[PDB]
Amino acid sequence: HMALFQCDFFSDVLGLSTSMTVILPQEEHPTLFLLHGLSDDHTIWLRRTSIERYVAEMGLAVVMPAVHRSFYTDMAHGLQYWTFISEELPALARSFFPLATAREDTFVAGLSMGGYGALKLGMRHPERFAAAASLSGALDITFVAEQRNIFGDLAALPGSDHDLFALAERMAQSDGPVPKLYQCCGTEDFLYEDNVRFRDHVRGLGLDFMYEESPGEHEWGYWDAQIQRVLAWLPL
Amino acid sequence: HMALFQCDFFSDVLGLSTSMTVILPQEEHPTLFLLHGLSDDHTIWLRRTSIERYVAEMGLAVVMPAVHRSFYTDMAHGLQYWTFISEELPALARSFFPLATAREDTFVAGLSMGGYGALKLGMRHPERFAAAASLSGALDITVWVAEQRNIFGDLAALPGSDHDLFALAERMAQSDGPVPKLYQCCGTEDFLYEDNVRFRDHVRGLGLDFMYEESPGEHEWGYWDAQIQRVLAWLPL
């Protein structure tokens, strides 16, 4: 059985009462941090997929937080959602629940915006994640007012620590352990062309990298199917 | 977009504070009452299937209540879960939410125990349901024995009783009044498969029109996640 937790807690980093959904195996569980997309909250994975069922025999906890429309970024005009997602949230989840801390037992995945977030986490903090997966990700954040609120000076984005293309090259230069990477996209997604460009870039860097594509749009039926393939791929 | 409601309310019939999950289309919606199985609560359909996504374009509300381990029965030793499910619960849902009341806009479906409950509702109150569907249903109800006695009372009196779907089907076969659209499915490896085949053969021999489907499967949520999509397409919506 999986136990389901709707958690209403305080974030000191955000200065905000907020929520997350956690599923735990019932008797230091390896943990998948599962990130939502643009306009989503912490409830969408549970509602629009059968994620709880898919993990049921894996001995795997899943943590599903909320980051509003932040692109997992410490916003130029907004709250500190990167510091939240990369530092405070995992700490809070580990303080509440019997979750692993070891890199080998820690994974991250997300769709769209959360695919960007997952790869950013894996590549900025390779020492914290064994695997990072993007589903139909917004993988090129280079460039309107909302984007400026998130990133600030848009012209400063290429080559920055926000730029997954540059982050991938930096991670590939590490000599320490780095996460395995997974990327998928539906071939009719508006983000498909960005995905192809990222794939062609990241696959030449000597990384442990898996790409998949098939018919699909920016749509939950596609992610319900694909998340099962991500789960099978996790180095659990 | 569908709006999701976790509802904590009081049941006068049960004398108990309890809960249900409701999903509503966002702008008198036709409503599917979607019943849980044995050991489940009002959260299982949302958790183990993508039901909210499956209904998203249908203009269909879904009401998922809890009845504990009652088999949708006014228990001989327990609470009045049949009066709750058949009378109070739909009234409460309609009082809270912009839900239809008309027979033509009212449907019920369930797995296991809830498949029994759905067909019981459809055959006891055919005037209230346009359609009733059972998925891997516990369709023959004739520590575990003690629990059955708590639910049904004298077990020897069950055959032919108003609890017995086989008897209810005989009533329906002779009815001149409204008969709901009726659906039955089961996985061929389910422990309840034999009971399902016996119920199917019974209703078919009576002339009672059912859509019957079977395919490989056990008593598990992968099968119901797939099958509920077929039930949704089949609803006379």
Added chain:
Amino acid sequence: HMALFQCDFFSDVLGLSTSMTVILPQEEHPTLFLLHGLSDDHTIWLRRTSIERYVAEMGLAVVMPAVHRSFYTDMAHGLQYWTFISEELPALARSFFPLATAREDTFVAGLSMGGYGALKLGMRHPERFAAAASLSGALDITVWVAEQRNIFGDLAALPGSDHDLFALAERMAQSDGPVPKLYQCCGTEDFLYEDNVRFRDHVRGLGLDFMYEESPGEHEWGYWDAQIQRVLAWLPL
């Protein structure tokens, strides 16, 4: 009995899936929109007070939404939380639940940030609210500085603007149209006490009829739990 609803719904104005808590009397209910403070969400009123009990005999619904750290403002750098709170949210609540629309049956109240929001609603839309109440409100809005800029834009342009409750009060004092019942309270040890005294003196000098109350207290929920009972008794219900 009151029924409790945790509602997860989509806001088109915000472009965001979000949540609210609603309590409904169990059988077009008059409705109190009850606003949270700075750093709070839609759950705090239920958790830190006995609001559900306090309204239980009033035939009054309560809607408790979330606006993050927005000060109920269409942010210069952020989302449109004023259009959300003043337009979309009441519409959504009324679409989901059997809530009144009439001015005479519509009230708003809030603490801190939400007291500012309540009085902003009452004074910008006096035709929509029979009453507006502020509890320990942040009634003068003229890292923290950067956040204020994200909310309000050019801070130097705030005095006299449509964000400025002092200016809105001047409009109301000259209005021939409907004016809501208005309430203001604050604990005498609250950091916001001085701002509250300045707002009180301003509106009193204008002739704008407020019930004003003060007593020992800080910016904390014990005080609001006590004071919300007085606000409830004061509502023109």
Added chain:
Amino acid sequence: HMALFQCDFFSDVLGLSTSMTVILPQEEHPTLFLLHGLSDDHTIWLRRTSIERYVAEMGLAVVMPAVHRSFYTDMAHGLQYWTFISEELPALARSFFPLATAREDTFVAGLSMGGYGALKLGMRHPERFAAAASLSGALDITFVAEQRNIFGDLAALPGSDHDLFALAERMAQSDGPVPKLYQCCGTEDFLYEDNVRFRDHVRGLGLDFMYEESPGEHEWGYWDAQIQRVLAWLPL
């Protein structure tokens, strides 16, 4: 800050998916198991009192489970709610959350039916609880169909292991550590006379026992006030 958890989990003892509400201090917390009354569920304490606020500075976790209309009893015709509340539930809560196991850090309290339940737990398992409190308790369960479903043969109740009057005498004969006991009741409660009888009985047994009464009915305003006094009395 307190973090709030709505927990939907499976009970093997009950054979049932069920729920509880838990509040945790935010950074082995001592834990108060806080029991609901007749017709209540696991949500009523949070809704009708300010319990979360009252415990906010205490370093105290609160666990609020659901037992339906069972009187915290392994029912003669029903489910095993005593085995659930006394064995499975605390184990599950301790498996999910960072809660203490030590007797010295474990307390129980409840209103009505849950006051009966709390004292039954304290007196049947003195080795597990440092303190047990009843608020407007249904403290005399001696004797309709529902009562028979709960207790079975009603004539067998006097002197039984269901009978708090007898349990109190048995606990007072223990030589090992036993919980401090608290009892209160509103003077206009229908249960007042039963409470006076229990008080007069239990206060002559050499126990650590505190009684309080004041005007009140079987009503949440009274319990909102009284639970604060219980919290101050806990040997925390």
